[PDB]
């Protein structure tokens, strides 16, 4: 079983010798000339109540408009931003959600958390009365995320170390992704649904394609867990978070890191992470309870979006870059503009 | 447009009306976390108080509402879905003394780990000792042994307040002391008065594990309501 | 993140012998550092751990007075000492790691699966 051994450490030295062939200069040389973005000083424009707990996440709407939002008190509330006001409220079985997502259709929104269950709400019932639909079991672990690819396909991802995709007509699991020695911590869909990443527990970024059920690549470099992640809009690329108290950029074609964001007085961990509709800002959400703007291009940090009183647990963008959102431990939410 | 507004305001109105109903409810309800090893005996006291992912269980002591959650079919990683229970009202935490390859140093390694948790500086920690009758049985057919894992257990001198019941063997009273006193090494150290330790022995069939964790919720509630008014 | 022992072998009852960590990929000092061993039979259980900066120590119980933990920050390398080793000895000797830097909680060294943990080095008594 030794050989065994032999040959993995070996591939490893061979896959590292590759990488290091590839590797030529880096990102912050390529971009050593370009101008800096500058002071960002946003301010918030609203703030929504209601919560009664702790926001664990939230997402928004393909229209740019409308929100879902989900905390521990076992609640989920569909604000229209621009009027804050409450349009939906729903009461969970599992007072323990972890995650929620907003169907690109706008009809549909998912949930779940400790209770291993992905559950299916209609928004555009006959009646008008938000009703469960269809219940998804099959994992062995609290479900750390969720996203849709249409009306009948979710991807789910859980603490049990495997990444499923189902068919939410017949209930059925169709695929069957494993791999990852940690626990999943989230995924995010490819801007064409081609592909999927997700960052596990073991500072290890795997790479998917969602139709062979199979893995692709597998990105290293962080030296603690793996709490967010993110595709970058154009696709080829994606950052993540990790407890080391750094984020980085990971080029699916380049099979390794161009550049990490990190700096002397920051000693906490990331929660959250998104990019701008241009692509060239970066937030990040920390347990400081400070937002921070850093430059992609620059690795600079050009602003901060200090306001919560609490843990960052979330955050979010619309599909038209008009106004960030975020929720926090404090249970309120702050739009950004 | 007027009376899409109108609509849209009833609505909002109707929903915070009952928004307003539900936050009347989840402020008098309390959130307890039910930890324990494998083998501490922790289902037994689940049935006596009750007499997927997450088991829940409603209770209520003297018209108070408590909320407790039995953890279940998780991997033993527990370092990040621990998170989500540092808003609770107090972590129960049991515990076998008839332990002692040796659990007793994993509970003790186990509960420094939740002590010195930044997220849980303030969720203060119950404590029990499930296997006291166990450890007397142990130590009393000379198995106990207990220098041999601990080289200070026989220099151990029994504390002043003893208060033994019934039948006791003095050596029974010093060891099951000393079980206590080494978690109670951790529970003093980086204090600081936010949150507290509360040691106890109680049998896995005892009734009034109840009554001692509502006594020991209410101790809670009146020291954080005296902090926020700088009495304490 | 790797950690991969090196220095084991056999010796008899109340010999002695060295068992150096070599560790690569991350910064040493901000860690905590662990030692964990297995024995036939039975799962894992801990044994001893040291501080960032080696001001605090503690140990097991059952091997009290027997052992001693080192570490050399400057040489990101682990050490324990053996002498009167007993028959219960024999066993893998894994060289761990806590999960969070600058945190002084150390979870899941000793879960079946953890991430950070070497393959560990055989000392056979």
């Known amino acids: 079983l030794d050989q065994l051994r032999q040959e993995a450490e070996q591939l490893k030295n061979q896959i590292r010798d590759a990488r290091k062939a590839c590797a030529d200069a880096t990102l912050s040389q390529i971009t050593n000339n370009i101008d800096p973005v500058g002071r960002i000083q946003m301010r918030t424009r609203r703030t929504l109540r209601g919560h009664l707990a702790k926001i664990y996440a939230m997402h928004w709407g393909t229209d740019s408009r409308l929100l879902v939002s989900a905390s521990q008190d076992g609640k989920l509330i569909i604000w229209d931003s621009y009027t804050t006001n409450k349009v939906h409220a729903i009461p969970l079985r599992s007072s323990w959600v972890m995650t929620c997502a907003y169907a690109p259709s706008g009809n549909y929104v998912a949930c779940g958390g400790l209770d291993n269950i992905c559950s299916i709400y209609n928004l555009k019932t006959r009646e008008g009365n938000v009703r469960v639909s269809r219940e998804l079991a099959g994992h062995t672990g609290y479900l750390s995320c969720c996203r849709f690819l249409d009306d009948n396909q979710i991807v789910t991802s859980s603490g049990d170390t495997t990444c499923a995709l189902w068919d939410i007509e017949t209930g059925q699991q169709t695929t069957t992704f494993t791999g990852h020695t940690g626990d999943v911590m989230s995924l995010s869909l490819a801007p064409d649904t081609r592909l999927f990443v997700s960052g596990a527990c073991d500072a290890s970024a795997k790479l998917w394609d969602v139709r062979e059920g199979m893995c692709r690549q597998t990105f290293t470099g962080h030296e603690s867990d793996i709490n967010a992640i993110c595709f970058f809009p154009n696709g080829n690329a994606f950052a993540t978070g990790s407890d080391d108290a750094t984020c980085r950029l990971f080029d699916l074609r380049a099979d390794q890191e161009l550049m990490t964001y990190s700096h002397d007085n920051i000693i906490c961990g990331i929660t959250s992470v998104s990019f701008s509709k241009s692509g060239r800002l970066l937030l990040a959400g920390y347990d400081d309870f400070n937002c921070n703007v850093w430059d992609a291009l620059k690795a600079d940090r050009a602003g901060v979006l200090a306001g919560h009183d609490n843990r960052v647990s979330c955050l979010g963008v619309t599909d038209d870059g008009m106004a960030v959102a975020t929720g926090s431990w404090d249970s309120f939410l702050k739009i950004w503009n | 447009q007027r009376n899409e507004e109108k609509a849209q305001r009833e609505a909002n109105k109707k929903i915070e009306k009952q928004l307003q109903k539900d936050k009347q409810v989840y402020r008098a309800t309390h959130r307890l976390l039910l930890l324990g090893a494998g083998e501490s005996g922790k289902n037994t006291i689940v049935k006596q108080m009750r007499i997927s992912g997450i088991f829940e269980t409603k209770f209520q002591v003297d018209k108070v509402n408590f909320h407790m959650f039995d953890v279940g079919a998780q991997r033993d990683e527990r370092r990040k879905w621990i998170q989500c229970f540092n808003d609770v009202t107090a972590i129960i935490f049991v515990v076998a003394s008839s332990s002692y390859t040796n659990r007793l140093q994993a509970a003790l390694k186990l509960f420094d780990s939740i002590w010195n948790n930044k997220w849980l500086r303030d969720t203060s920690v119950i404590l029990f000792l499930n296997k006291q009758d166990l450890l007397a049985e142990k130590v009393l057919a000379g198995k106990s042994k207990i220098e041999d894992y601990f080289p200070e257990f026989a220099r151990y001198t029994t504390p002043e307040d003893a208060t033994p019941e019934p039948g006791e063997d003095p050596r029974v009273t010093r060891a099951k002391y000393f079980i206590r006193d080494e978690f109670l090494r951790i529970s003093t150290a980086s204090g600081d008065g936010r949150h507290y330790c509360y040691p106890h022995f109680t049998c896995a069939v005892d009734t009034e594990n109840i009554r001692r964790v509502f006594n020991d919720c209410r101790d809670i509630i009146q020291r954080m309501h005296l902090r926020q008014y700088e009495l304490l | 993140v790797q950690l991969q022992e090196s220095g084991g072998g056999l010796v008899q009852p109340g010999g002695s012998l060295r068992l150096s960590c070599a560790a690569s990929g991350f910064t040493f000092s901000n860690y905590k550092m662990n030692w964990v061993r297995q024995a036939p039979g039975k799962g894992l259980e801990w044994v001893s751990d040291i501080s960032q900066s080696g001001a605090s120590i503690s140990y097991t119980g059952s091997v009290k007075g027997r052992f001693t933990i080192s570490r050399d920050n400057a040489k990101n390398t682990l050490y324990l000492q053996m002498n009167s080793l007993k028959p219960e000895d024999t066993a893998v000797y894994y060289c761990?790691?806590?999960?969070?830097?600058?945190?002084?909680?150390?979870?899941?060294?000793?879960?079946?699966?953890?991430?950070?943990r070497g393959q560990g080095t055989q000392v056979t008594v």
């Open positions: 761990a790691r806590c999960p969070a830097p600058f945190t002084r909680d150390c979870f899941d060294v000793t879960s079946t699966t953890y991430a950070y």
